[PDB]
N, CA, C and O of each residue as an XYZ file, in Angstrom:
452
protein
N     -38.949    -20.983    -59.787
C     -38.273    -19.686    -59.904
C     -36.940    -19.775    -59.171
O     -37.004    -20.354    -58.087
N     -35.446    -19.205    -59.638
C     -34.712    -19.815    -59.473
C     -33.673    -18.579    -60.038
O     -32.672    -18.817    -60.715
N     -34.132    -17.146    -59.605
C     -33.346    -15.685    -60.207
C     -33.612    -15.557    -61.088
O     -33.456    -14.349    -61.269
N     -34.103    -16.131    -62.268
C     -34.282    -16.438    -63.827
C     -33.916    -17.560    -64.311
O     -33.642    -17.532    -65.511
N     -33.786    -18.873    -63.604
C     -33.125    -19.913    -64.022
C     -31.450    -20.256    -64.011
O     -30.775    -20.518    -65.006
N     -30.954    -20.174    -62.530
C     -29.746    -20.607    -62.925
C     -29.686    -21.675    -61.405
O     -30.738    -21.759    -60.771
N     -28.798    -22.231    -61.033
C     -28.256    -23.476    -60.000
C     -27.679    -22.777    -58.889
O     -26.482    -22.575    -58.683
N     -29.208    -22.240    -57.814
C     -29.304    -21.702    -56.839
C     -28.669    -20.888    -56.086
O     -28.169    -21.053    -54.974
N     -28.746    -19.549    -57.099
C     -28.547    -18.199    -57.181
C     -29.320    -17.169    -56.785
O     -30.489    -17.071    -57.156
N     -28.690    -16.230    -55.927
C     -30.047    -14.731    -55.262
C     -29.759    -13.941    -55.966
O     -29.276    -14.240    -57.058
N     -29.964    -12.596    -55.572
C     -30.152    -11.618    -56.078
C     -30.286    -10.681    -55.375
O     -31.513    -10.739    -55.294
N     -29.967     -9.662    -54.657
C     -29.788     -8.771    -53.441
C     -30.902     -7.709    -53.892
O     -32.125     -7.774    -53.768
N     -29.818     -6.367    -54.646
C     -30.971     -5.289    -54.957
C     -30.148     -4.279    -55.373
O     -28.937     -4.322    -55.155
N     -30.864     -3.050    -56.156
C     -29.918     -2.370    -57.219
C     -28.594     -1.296    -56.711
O     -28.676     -0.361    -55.914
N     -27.803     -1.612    -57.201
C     -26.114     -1.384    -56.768
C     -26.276      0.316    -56.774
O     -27.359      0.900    -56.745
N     -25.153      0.860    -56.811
C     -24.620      2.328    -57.326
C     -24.009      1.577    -58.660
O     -23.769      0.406    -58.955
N     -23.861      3.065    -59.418
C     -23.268      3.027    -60.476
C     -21.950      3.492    -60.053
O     -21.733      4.536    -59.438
N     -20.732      2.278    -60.588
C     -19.150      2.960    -60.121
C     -18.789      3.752    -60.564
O     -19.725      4.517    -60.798
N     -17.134      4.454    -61.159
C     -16.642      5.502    -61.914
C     -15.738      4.395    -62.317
O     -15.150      4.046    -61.293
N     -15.319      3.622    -63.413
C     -14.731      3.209    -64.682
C     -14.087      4.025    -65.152
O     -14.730      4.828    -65.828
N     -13.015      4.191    -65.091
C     -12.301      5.173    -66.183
C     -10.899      4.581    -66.777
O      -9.779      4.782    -66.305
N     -11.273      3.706    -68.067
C     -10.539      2.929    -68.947
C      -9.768      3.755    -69.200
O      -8.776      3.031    -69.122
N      -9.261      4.982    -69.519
C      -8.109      6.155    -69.660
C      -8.130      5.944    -70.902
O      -6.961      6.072    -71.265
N      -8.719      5.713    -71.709
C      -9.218      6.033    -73.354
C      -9.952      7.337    -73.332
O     -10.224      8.006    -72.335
N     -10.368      7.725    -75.200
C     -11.064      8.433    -75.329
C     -12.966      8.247    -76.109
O     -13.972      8.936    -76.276
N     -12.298      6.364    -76.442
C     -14.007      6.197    -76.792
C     -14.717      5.417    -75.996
O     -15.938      5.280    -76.081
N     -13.576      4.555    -74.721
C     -14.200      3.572    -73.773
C     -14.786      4.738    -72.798
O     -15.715      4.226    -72.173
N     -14.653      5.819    -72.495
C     -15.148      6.351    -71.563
C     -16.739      7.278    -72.043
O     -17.748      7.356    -71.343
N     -16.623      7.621    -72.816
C     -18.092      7.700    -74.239
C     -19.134      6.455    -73.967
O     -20.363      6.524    -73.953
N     -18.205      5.158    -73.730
C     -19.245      4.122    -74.342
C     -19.513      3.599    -73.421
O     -20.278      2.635    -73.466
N     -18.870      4.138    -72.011
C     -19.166      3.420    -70.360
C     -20.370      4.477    -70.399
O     -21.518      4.110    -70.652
N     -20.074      5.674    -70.161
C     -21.315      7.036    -70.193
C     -22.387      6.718    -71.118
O     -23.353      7.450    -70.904
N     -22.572      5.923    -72.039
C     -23.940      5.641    -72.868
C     -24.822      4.836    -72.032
O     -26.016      5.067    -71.841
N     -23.835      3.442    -71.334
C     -24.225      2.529    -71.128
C     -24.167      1.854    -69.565
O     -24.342      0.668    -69.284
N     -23.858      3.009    -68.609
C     -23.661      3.174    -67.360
C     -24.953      3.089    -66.649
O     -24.829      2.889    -65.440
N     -26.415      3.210    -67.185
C     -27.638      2.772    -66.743
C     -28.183      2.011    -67.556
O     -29.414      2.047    -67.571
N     -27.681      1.334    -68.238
C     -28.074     -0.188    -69.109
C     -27.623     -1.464    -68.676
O     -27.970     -2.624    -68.898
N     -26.711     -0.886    -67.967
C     -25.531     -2.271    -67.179
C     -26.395     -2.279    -65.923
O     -26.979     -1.421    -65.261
N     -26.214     -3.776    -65.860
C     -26.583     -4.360    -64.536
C     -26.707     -3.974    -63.153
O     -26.129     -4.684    -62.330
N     -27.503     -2.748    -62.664
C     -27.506     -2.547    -61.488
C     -27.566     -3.482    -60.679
O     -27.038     -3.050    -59.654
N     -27.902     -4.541    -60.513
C     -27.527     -5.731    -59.970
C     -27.313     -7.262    -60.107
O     -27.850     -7.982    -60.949
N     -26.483     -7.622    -59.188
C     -26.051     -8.988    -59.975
C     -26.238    -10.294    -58.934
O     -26.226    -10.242    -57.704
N     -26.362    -11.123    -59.525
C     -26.696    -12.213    -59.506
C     -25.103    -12.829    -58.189
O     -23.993    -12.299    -58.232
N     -25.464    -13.943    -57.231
C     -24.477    -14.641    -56.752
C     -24.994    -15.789    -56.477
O     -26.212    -15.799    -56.649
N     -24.288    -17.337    -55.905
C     -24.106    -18.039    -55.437
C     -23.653    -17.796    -53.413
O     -22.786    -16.934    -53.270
N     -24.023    -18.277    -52.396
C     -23.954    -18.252    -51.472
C     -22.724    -18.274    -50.962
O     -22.434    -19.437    -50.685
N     -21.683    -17.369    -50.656
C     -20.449    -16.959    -49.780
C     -19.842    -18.317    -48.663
O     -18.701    -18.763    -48.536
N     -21.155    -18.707    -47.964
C     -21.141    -19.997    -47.028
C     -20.195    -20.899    -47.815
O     -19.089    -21.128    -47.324
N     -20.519    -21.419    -48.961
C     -20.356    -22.355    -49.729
C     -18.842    -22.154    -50.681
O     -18.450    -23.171    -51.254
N     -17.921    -20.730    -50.863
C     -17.340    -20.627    -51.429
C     -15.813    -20.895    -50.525
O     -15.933    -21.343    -49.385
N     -14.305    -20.591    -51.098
C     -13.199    -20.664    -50.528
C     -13.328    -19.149    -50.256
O     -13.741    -18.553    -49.261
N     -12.872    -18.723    -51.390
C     -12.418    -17.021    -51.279
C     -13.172    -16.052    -51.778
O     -14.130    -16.535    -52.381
N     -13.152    -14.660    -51.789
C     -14.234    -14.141    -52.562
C     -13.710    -13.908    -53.990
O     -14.502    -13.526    -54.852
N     -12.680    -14.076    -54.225
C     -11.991    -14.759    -55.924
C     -13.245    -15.692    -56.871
O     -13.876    -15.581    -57.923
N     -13.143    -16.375    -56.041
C     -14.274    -17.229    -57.074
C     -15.906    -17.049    -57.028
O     -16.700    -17.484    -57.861
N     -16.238    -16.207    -55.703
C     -17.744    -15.781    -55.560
C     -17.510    -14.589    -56.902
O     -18.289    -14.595    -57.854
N     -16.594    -13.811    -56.839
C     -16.321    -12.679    -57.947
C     -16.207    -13.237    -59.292
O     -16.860    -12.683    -60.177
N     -15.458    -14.279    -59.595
C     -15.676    -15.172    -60.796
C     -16.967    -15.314    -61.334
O     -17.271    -15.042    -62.495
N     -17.379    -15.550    -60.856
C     -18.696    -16.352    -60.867
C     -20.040    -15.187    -60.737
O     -20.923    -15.248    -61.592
N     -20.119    -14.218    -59.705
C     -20.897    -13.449    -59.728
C     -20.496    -12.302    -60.814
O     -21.170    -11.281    -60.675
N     -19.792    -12.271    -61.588
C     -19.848    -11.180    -62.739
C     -19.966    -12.200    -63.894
O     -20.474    -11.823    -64.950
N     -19.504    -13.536    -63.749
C     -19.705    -14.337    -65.211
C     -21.077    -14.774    -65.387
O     -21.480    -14.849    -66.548
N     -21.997    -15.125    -64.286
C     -23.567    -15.394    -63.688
C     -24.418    -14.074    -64.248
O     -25.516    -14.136    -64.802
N     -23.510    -12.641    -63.922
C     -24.657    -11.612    -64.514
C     -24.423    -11.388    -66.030
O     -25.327    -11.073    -66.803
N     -22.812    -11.625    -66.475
C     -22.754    -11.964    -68.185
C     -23.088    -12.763    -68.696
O     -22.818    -13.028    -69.868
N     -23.802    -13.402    -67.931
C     -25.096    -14.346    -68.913
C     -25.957    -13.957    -69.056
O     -26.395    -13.636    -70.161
N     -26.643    -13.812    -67.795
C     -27.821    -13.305    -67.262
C     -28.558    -11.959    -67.930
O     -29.525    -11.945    -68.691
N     -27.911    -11.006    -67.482
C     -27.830    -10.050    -67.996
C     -27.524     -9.772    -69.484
O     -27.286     -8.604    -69.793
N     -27.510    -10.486    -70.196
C     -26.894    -10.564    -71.986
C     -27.622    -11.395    -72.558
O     -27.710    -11.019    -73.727
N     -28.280    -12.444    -72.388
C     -29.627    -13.135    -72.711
C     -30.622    -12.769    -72.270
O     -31.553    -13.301    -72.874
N     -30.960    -12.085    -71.470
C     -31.885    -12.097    -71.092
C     -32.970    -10.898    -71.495
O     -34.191    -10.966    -71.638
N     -32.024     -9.741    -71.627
C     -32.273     -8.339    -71.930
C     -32.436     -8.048    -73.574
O     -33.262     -7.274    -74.057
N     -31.867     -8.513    -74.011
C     -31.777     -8.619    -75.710
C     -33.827     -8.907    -75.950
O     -34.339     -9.181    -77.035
N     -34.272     -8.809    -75.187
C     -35.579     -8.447    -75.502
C     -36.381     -7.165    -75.756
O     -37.411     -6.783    -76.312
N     -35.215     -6.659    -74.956
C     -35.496     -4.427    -75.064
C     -34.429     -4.001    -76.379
O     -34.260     -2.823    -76.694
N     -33.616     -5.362    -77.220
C     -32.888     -5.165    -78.287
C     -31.404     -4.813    -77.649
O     -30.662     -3.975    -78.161
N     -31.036     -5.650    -76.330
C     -29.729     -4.802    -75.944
C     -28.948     -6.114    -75.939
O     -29.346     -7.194    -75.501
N     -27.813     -5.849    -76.479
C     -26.968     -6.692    -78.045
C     -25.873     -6.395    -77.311
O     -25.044     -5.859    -78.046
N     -25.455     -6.505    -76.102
C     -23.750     -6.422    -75.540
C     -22.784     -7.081    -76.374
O     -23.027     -8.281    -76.496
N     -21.686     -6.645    -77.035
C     -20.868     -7.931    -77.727
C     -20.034     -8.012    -76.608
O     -20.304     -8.002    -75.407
N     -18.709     -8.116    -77.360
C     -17.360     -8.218    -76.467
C     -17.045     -7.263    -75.490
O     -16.780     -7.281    -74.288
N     -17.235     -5.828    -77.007
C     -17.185     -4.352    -76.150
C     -17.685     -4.426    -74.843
O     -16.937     -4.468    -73.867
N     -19.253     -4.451    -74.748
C     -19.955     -3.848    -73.920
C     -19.830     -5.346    -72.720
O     -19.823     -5.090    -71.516
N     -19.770     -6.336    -73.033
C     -19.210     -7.726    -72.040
C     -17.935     -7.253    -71.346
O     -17.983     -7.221    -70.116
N     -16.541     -6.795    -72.083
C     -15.520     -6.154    -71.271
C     -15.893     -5.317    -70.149
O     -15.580     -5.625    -68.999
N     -16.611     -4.173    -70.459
C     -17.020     -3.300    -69.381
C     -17.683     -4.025    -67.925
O     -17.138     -4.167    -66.831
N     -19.192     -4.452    -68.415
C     -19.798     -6.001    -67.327
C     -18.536     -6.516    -66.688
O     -18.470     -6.480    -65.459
N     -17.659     -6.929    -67.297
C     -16.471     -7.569    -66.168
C     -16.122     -6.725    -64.982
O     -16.091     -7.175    -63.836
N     -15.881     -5.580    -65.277
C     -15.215     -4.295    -64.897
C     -16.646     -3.928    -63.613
O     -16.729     -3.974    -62.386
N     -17.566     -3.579    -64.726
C     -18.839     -2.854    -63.880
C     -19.286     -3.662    -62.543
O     -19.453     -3.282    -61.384
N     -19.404     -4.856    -63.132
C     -20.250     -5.777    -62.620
C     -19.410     -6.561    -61.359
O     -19.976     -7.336    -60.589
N     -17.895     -6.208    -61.282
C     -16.808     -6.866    -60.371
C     -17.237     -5.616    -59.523
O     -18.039     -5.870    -58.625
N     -16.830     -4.279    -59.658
C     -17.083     -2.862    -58.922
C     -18.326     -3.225    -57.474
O     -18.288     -3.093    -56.250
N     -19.649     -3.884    -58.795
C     -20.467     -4.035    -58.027
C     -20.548     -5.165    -57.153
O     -20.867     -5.018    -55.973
N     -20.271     -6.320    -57.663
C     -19.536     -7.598    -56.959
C     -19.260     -7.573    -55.737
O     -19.923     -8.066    -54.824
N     -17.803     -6.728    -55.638
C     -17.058     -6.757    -53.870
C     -17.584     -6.527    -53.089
O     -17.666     -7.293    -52.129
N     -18.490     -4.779    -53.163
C     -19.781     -4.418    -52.801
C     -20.486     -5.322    -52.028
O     -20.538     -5.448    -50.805
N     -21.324     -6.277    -53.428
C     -22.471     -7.398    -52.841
C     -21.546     -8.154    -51.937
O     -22.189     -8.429    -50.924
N     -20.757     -8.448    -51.883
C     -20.168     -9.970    -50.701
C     -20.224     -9.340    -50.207
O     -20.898     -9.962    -49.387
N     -20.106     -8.070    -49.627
C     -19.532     -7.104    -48.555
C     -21.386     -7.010    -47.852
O     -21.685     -6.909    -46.662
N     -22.097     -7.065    -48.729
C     -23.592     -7.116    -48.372
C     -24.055     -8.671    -47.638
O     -24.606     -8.805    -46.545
N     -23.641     -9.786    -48.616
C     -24.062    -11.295    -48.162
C     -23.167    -12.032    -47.201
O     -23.616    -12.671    -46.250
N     -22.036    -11.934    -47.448
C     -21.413    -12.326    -46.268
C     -21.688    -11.589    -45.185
O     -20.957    -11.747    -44.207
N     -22.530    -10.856    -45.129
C     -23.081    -10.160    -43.524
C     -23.329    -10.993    -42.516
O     -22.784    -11.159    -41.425
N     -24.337    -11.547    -43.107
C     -25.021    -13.038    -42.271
C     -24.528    -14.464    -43.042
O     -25.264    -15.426    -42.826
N     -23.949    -14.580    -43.475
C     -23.437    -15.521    -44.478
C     -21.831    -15.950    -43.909
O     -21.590    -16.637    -42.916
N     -20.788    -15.302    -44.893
C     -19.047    -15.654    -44.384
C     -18.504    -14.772    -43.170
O     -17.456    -15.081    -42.604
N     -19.370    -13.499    -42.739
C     -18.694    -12.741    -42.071
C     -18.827    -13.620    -40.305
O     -17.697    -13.330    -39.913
N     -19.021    -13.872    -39.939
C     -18.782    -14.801    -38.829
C     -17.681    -15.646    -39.262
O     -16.624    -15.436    -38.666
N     -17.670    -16.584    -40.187
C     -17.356    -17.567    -40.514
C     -16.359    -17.682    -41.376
O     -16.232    -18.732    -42.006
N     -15.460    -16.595    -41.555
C     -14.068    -16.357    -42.189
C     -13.366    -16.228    -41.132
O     -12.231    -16.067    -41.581
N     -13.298    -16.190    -39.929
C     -12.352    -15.839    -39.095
C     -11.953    -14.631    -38.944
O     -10.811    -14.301    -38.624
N     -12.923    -13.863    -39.177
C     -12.838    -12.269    -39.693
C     -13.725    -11.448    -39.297
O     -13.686    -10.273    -39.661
């Protein structure tokens, strides 16, 4: 066991939902459909191990657009591009958040910070 199978990745515990507001009139419809379908939480790689939180953020929203998009398509939930754009968005919101959670005991000593 391994989060669901990926190259030694955690998993913390379920986020808040952010406020997204693409300043459209159908992206904000289609964030509100799908604002408790999206990933309350996401997937990372260990902070210890990274440079910046640039690439823990890379990586921890591209880790749950996998994750989260294969995996779920079992309850029939079919993210394309659309609903993958948002995950970038949602899932970064929730992102900064999580480092702000793992680097607790993790980079926050150990950034010089």
């Amino acid at each position: 066991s391994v989060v669901g199978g990926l190259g030694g990745y955690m998993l913390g515990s379920a986020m808040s939902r952010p406020m997204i507001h693409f300043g459209n009139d159908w992206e904000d419809r289609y964030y509100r459909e799908n604002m408790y379908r999206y990933p309350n939480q996401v997937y990372y790689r260990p902070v210890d191990q990274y440079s910046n939180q640039n690439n823990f953020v890379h990586d921890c929203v591209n880790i749950t657009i996998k994750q989260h998009t294969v995996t779920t398509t079992t309850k029939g939930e079919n993210f394309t591009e659309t609903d993958v754009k948002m995950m970038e968005r949602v899932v970064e919101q929730m992102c900064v958040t999580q480092y702000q959670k793992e680097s607790q005991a993790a980079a926050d000593g150990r950034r010089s910070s």
